[PDB]
Design an enzyme around this catalytic site. Structure first.
Site: not given
Ligand code: 1SU
Ligand code: FMN
Ligand code: ORO
Length: 363
Positions: A224, A118, A184, A67, A114-115, A253, A89, A186-187, A69
């Site tokens: 991990k 790193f 990972s 999340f 996801n890919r 992972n 990572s 993806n490496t 990184k």
């Molecule tokens: N968590 C999360 C999350 C997410 O929400 C967030 C995150 C941080 C924040 F600070 C807020 N804040 C608010 O909601 C409050 C707010 C403030 C201003 C205006 C408004 C409004 F717009 F509502 F007016 C509302 C919301 C959105 C996308 C998203 N994507 C994720 N992951 C992936 O895509 C893949 C990689 C796995 S996690 C994620």
């Molecule tokens: C977009 C994305 C990026 C990630 N990057 C990393 C990473 O950089 N290093 C790592 O150890 N794991 C990484 N992960 C794996 C997560 O840390 C976790 O081990 C895995 O997503 C399973 O948890 P979840 O299903 O609750 O997301 C990643 C996963 C996602 C979806």
């Molecule tokens: O960097 C990435 O793509 C990555 C790293 C890791 O540890 N796990 C994952 O799902 N993606």
């Protein structure tokens, strides 16, 4: 559930609906650094507190590596209500990572492929960024909020070991625990560091650089491991962990498997599958690895978590701590309060002293 339902039904669907999966993740991070996030009105009940890796974890729910990184949004995550944060990572030198697209939503199976490969701003930077907040993290840690640092390797780095050591050098001091990312998908041939001979060599050099630091600096070292291991792979990792006295494990992972009956119209895409379909594998691998460690190695259970029950199951199968990521994509920041809340419930309901009193009960 009111705020939780609204993020799940509306605010997130309209967001993930609006933007590509990556841009969504990029925004989530930036919004979290900027502090544009709601305040979780949940004070953790004394129950959920856990001590392990010689640290106080106010609550056992943490954010998984991938999340934040590059370690931009540390405080935001804590305010989100996470008991501990894991950044990375991180790679020695900074690198682009694979080209976009590289994040795909599987809305239907509440999952994500996801890919990223790193993408990292590199140690040199992330250092400055952690050094800058050095002192607030100190207070946060002794207040029960530890910080973990996940270490990786550059795409074209010949000996990953020299890469990691350099990681333990630079970020080991500012870390309350280090993750050796060996999992990972993806490496290039990274998963081949789970091999007995190559894993022992790696962790020996890491610990050599580690046990070469001021005691107060010394972070917990964890490994991990992927959810996709042979009956053999698991055993050898267990051995080489105990054999070397590694402070703990993270399990698991992402998987390169595609469990039969994925509805996701993007399930064919190359990379690691996060979220719901991983939940079972992760728990079965957390369990199997507990039996192998004889419960004497601290496991952080991650993969599929999105509910209190989800978390419990990991805890009960050996999980000394839990992590989640993919959930957020769908449940938004409120999922953190939700799991903790629904945990306290399924703890008290089954009659448990706290969390510690359920760590590997399934055994
Ligand atoms: N968590 C999360 C999350 C997410 O929400 C967030 C995150 C941080 C924040 F600070 C807020 N804040 C608010 O909601 C409050 C707010 C403030 C201003 C205006 C408004 C409004 F717009 F509502 F007016 C509302 C919301 C959105 C996308 C998203 N994507 C994720 N992951 C992936 O895509 C893949 C990689 C796995 S996690 C994620
Ligand atoms: C977009 C994305 C990026 C990630 N990057 C990393 C990473 O950089 N290093 C790592 O150890 N794991 C990484 N992960 C794996 C997560 O840390 C976790 O081990 C895995 O997503 C399973 O948890 P979840 O299903 O609750 O997301 C990643 C996963 C996602 C979806
Ligand atoms: O960097 C990435 O793509 C990555 C790293 C890791 O540890 N796990 C994952 O799902 N993606």
């Amino acid at each position: 559930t009111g705020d939780e339902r609204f993020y799940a039904e509306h605010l997130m669907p309209t967001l993930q609906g609006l933007l590509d999966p990556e841009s969504a993740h990029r925004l989530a991070v930036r919004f979290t650094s900027l502090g544009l996030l709601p305040r979780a009105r949940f004070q953790d009940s004394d129950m959920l507190e856990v001590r392990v890796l010689g640290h106080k974890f106010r609550n056992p729910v943490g954010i998984a590596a991938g999340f934040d990184k590059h370690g931009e949004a540390v405080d935001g995550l804590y305010k989100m209500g996470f008991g501990f944060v894991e950044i990375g990572s991180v790679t020695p030198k900074p690198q682009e990572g694979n080209p976009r697209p590289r994040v795909f939503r599987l809305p239907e199976d509440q999952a994500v492929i996801n890919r990223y490969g790193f993408n990292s701003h590199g140690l040199s930077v992330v250092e400055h960024r952690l050094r800058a907040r050095q002192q607030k993290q100190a207070k946060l840690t002794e207040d029960g909020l530890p910080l973990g640092v996940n270490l990786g390797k550059n795409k074209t780095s010949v000996d990953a070991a020299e890469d990691y050591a350099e990681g333990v050098r630079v970020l080991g001091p500012l870390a309350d625990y280090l993750v050796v990312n060996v999992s990972s998908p993806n490496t290039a041939g990274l998963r081949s560091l789970q091999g007995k001979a190559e894993l022992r060599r790696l962790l020996t050099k890491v610990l050599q650089e580690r046990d070469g630091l001021r005691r107060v600096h010394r972070p917990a070292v964890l490994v991990k491991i992927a959810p996709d291991l042979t009956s053999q792979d698991k055993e050898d990792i267990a051995s080489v962990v105990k054999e070397l006295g590694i402070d703990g494990l993270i399990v698991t992972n992402t998987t390169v498997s595609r469990p039969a009956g994925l509805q996701g119209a993007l399930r064919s895409e190359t990379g690691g599958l996060s979220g719901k379909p991983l939940r079972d594998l992760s728990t079965q691998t957390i369990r199997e690895m507990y039996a192998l460690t004889q419960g004497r190695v601290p496991i952080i259970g991650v993969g599929g978590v999105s509910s209190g029950q989800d978390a419990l199951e990991k805890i009960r199968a050996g999980a000394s701590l839990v992590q989640l990521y993919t959930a957020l994509t769908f449940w938004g920041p409120p999922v953190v309060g939700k799991v903790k809340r629904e945990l306290e419930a399924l703890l008290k309901e089954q009659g448990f002293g706290g969390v510690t009193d359920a760590i590997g009960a399934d055994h």
